Amino acid sequence: LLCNYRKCRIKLSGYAWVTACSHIFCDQHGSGEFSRSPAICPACNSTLSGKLDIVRTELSPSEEYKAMVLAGLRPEIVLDISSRALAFWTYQVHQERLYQEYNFSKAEGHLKQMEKIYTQQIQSKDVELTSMKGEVTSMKKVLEEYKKKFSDISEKLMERNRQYQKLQGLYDSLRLR
Amino acid sequence: LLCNYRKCRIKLSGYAWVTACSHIFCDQHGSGEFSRSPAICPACNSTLSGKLDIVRTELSPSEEYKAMVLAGLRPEIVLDISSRALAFWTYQVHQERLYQEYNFSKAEGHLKQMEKIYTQQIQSKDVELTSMKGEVTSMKKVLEEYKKKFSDISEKLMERNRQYQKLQGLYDSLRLR
Amino acid sequence: MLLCNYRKCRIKLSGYAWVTACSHIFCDQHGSGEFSRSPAICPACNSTLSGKLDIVRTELSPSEEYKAMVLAGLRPEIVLDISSRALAFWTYQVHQERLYQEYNFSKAEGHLKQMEKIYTQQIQSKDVELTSMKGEVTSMKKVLEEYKKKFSDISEKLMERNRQYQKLQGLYDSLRLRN
Amino acid sequence: MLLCNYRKCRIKLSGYAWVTACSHIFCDQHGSGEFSRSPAICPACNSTLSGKLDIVRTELSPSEEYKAMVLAGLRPEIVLDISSRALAFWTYQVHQERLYQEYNFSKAEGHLKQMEKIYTQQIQSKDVELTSMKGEVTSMKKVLEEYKKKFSDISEKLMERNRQYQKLQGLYDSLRLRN
Ligand SMILES: [Zn+2]
Ligand SMILES: [Zn+2]
Ligand SMILES: [Zn+2]
Ligand SMILES: [Zn+2]
Ligand SMILES: [Zn+2]
Ligand SMILES: [Zn+2]
Ligand SMILES: [Zn+2]
Ligand SMILES: [Zn+2]
């Protein structure tokens, strides 16, 4: 068994506090909670007021106690008590199973949300890369055109140089005369 | 159930005293015997010294007690307790059956002794009857013998009378003389 | 521990037994004779059993493997329910035996008290016959004493007659002597 | 409520199931297939089963008549022993199911943490690619400015050379004027 206090859920050995609302708590939490005049079950918040609604029970009873607790009772009474005890145990097992299923469901939900956040950033990261790739291609095309303009300007510069040199020779020839 | 005190053997309801030696007693006998520091079980004379060797148990437990006495225990423990309680009940039933068989045997023994005495008194009186009948037969034999003697005496009487008459006639004849 | 519910059998049941939905159990011989028919009549209470499960041929000392597997896999609620019904059958059989024994004890006590009345009355009767014989013996004694007294008186009369005859003889003899 | 002990089935068991002496239960389909073999091996624990009562096809929803009659006639000690073994089987199935669930939860937690590590590494890769694009964008801007500024400077030198050509042309015209 495990403590039905949500923050403890520790394996129960020795002394435990059992409630009429089918809950069981460890010795420390049971003593602290079920010794107060206002007694509220920490699990289901049920208002327990009766004397037998709360019992401090040993989970490993001695041989003599087991041999004498139900001695003298009719078989119907013994069967009824055994039925109620096993009903308590099955309820505790069912609650533990539901708690584990809930935790597994929470883990699956966390994984799906994590995948959603990651995929949202995937699509964001791909768009930034594609946008930068498009900008780089546009700028490289502009650089290609400007280099072509550079080739034309250098050709005009060399052509002007040769025409300038031709005028140099004509000027020098007329100056010498 | 019945009180294991021999002189009580009353149906047990409400409160009873149960022993580790598989015996149960009524409230009055249980309290009286189990208030002694030197307390010995009246049924089997077992030396009881332990705490759980003596329990005052309610034979009609409340619903809340039945739902909480074994609440929290493992199914194996509950099975063990139920097994020992049913073992106690079967032992008590078996002892009651043996007691009833013992009472039937005692009744059979009393009947056989009753026939035994009755037959003896018949035989004694039958011999008395036979002795009286034998005496009566002897009386009848004596009666017949005396009747025969009476007849003989009557014959002697008539013979004497006739002789007396004949001598009377002779006397009368000599009277004429 | 159990007994055949047939009234004239009441034999201890071991090995195979036949259990009925009528809360009755019989030995193998009674069950085989009666519980092989499609319509089943309970030998104890004559109830008409017709269902398949109304009659079961069960071993009373089951093997360990059978005990471990017959209810294996069933939920605890089902197992408790089956145990409760099985114990209900056992208590019903125990109650029947207990009531039968108590009724027999009551019958024995009534027979015992009737025998006490019968024996005492027969003893009182036998005392009457003893008194009857005693009265007869007294009557015989009285009659015999009466006859003895009658004989004694007649004998006395006879002897007196004898003395009278002797006296007459003497008178006659003296009378003869005179003449 | 129970589940087939075959690992690839684990289906909720209702109606008929196959129970083993080694404390395992399987669905009708897997039980029929496995336990029709002469070499029949329990798929859960690989135990070699050979006995008769090691294999039972049990109904998980027994009729009321069956529940009232299956254990009828047995002693209370026998019924208690059967109940103990049946509850022992149920607790074993619950314990094995609990261990399986705990193992799967541990595996799920480990896989979840591994996916978080993998996702962060993939994000780290994309951040590296983003920095690579940042570096090339800076390179394009540096190339753009350097090339255009050098291109503009060469154009300015061309215009200065053209104006110097005009100056020489004017001086040549003046030299022509004098002659
Ligand atoms: Zn706690
Ligand atoms: Zn509660
Ligand atoms: Zn008493
Ligand atoms: Zn005792
Ligand atoms: Zn019947
Ligand atoms: Zn019979
Ligand atoms: Zn399966
Ligand atoms: Zn197995």
CSV table of C-alpha atoms in Angstrom, one decimal, chain A residues 63-141:
chain,number,residue,atom,x,y,z
A,63,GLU,CA,-0.1,-14.5,15.0
A,64,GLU,CA,-2.0,-14.3,18.2
A,65,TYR,CA,-4.0,-11.2,17.1
A,66,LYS,CA,-4.9,-12.9,13.8
A,67,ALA,CA,-6.0,-16.1,15.7
A,68,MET,CA,-8.2,-14.2,18.2
A,69,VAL,CA,-9.6,-11.0,16.5
A,70,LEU,CA,-12.4,-12.9,14.7
A,71,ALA,CA,-12.5,-15.9,16.9
A,72,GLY,CA,-16.1,-16.7,18.1
A,73,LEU,CA,-17.8,-14.9,15.2
A,74,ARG,CA,-20.2,-16.7,12.9
A,75,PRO,CA,-18.9,-17.7,9.4
A,76,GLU,CA,-21.3,-15.1,7.8
A,77,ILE,CA,-19.7,-12.3,9.9
A,78,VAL,CA,-16.2,-13.5,9.0
A,79,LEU,CA,-17.1,-13.6,5.3
A,80,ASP,CA,-18.6,-10.1,5.5
A,81,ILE,CA,-15.5,-8.7,7.2
A,82,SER,CA,-13.2,-10.4,4.6
A,83,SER,CA,-15.4,-9.0,1.8
A,84,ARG,CA,-15.1,-5.5,3.1
A,85,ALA,CA,-11.4,-5.7,3.6
A,86,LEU,CA,-10.8,-7.0,0.1
A,87,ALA,CA,-13.1,-4.3,-1.3
A,88,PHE,CA,-10.8,-1.8,0.5
A,89,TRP,CA,-7.7,-3.4,-1.1
A,90,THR,CA,-9.2,-3.5,-4.6
A,91,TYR,CA,-10.2,0.2,-4.3
A,92,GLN,CA,-6.6,1.0,-3.3
A,93,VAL,CA,-5.2,-1.0,-6.3
A,94,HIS,CA,-7.7,0.7,-8.6
A,95,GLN,CA,-6.7,4.2,-7.4
A,96,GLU,CA,-3.0,3.3,-7.9
A,97,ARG,CA,-3.7,2.1,-11.4
A,98,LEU,CA,-5.7,5.2,-12.2
A,99,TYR,CA,-2.8,7.4,-10.9
A,100,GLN,CA,-0.2,5.6,-13.0
A,101,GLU,CA,-2.4,5.9,-16.1
A,102,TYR,CA,-2.9,9.6,-15.4
A,103,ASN,CA,0.9,10.1,-15.2
A,104,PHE,CA,1.4,8.3,-18.4
A,105,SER,CA,-1.2,10.4,-20.1
A,106,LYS,CA,0.5,13.6,-18.7
A,107,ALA,CA,3.8,12.4,-20.2
A,108,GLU,CA,2.3,11.8,-23.6
A,109,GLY,CA,0.7,15.2,-23.5
A,110,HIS,CA,4.0,16.8,-22.6
A,111,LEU,CA,5.7,15.0,-25.5
A,112,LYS,CA,3.1,16.1,-28.0
A,113,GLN,CA,3.3,19.8,-26.9
A,114,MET,CA,7.1,19.5,-27.1
A,115,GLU,CA,6.9,18.2,-30.6
A,116,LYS,CA,4.5,21.0,-31.5
A,117,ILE,CA,6.9,23.7,-30.2
A,118,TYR,CA,9.8,22.1,-31.9
A,119,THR,CA,8.0,21.8,-35.3
A,120,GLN,CA,6.8,25.4,-35.0
A,121,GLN,CA,10.4,26.5,-34.7
A,122,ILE,CA,11.4,24.1,-37.5
A,123,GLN,CA,9.1,26.0,-39.9
A,124,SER,CA,10.3,29.3,-38.5
A,125,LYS,CA,14.0,28.3,-38.9
A,126,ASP,CA,13.4,27.1,-42.5
A,127,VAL,CA,11.7,30.4,-43.5
A,128,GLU,CA,14.6,32.6,-42.2
A,129,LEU,CA,17.1,30.4,-44.1
A,130,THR,CA,15.0,30.6,-47.3
A,131,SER,CA,14.5,34.3,-47.0
A,132,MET,CA,18.3,34.9,-46.5
A,133,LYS,CA,19.0,32.6,-49.5
A,134,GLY,CA,16.7,34.6,-51.7
A,135,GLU,CA,18.3,37.9,-50.6
A,136,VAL,CA,21.8,36.5,-51.3
A,137,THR,CA,20.8,35.4,-54.8
A,138,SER,CA,19.3,38.8,-55.5
A,139,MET,CA,22.5,40.6,-54.4
A,140,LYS,CA,24.8,38.3,-56.3
A,141,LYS,CA,22.8,39.0,-59.5
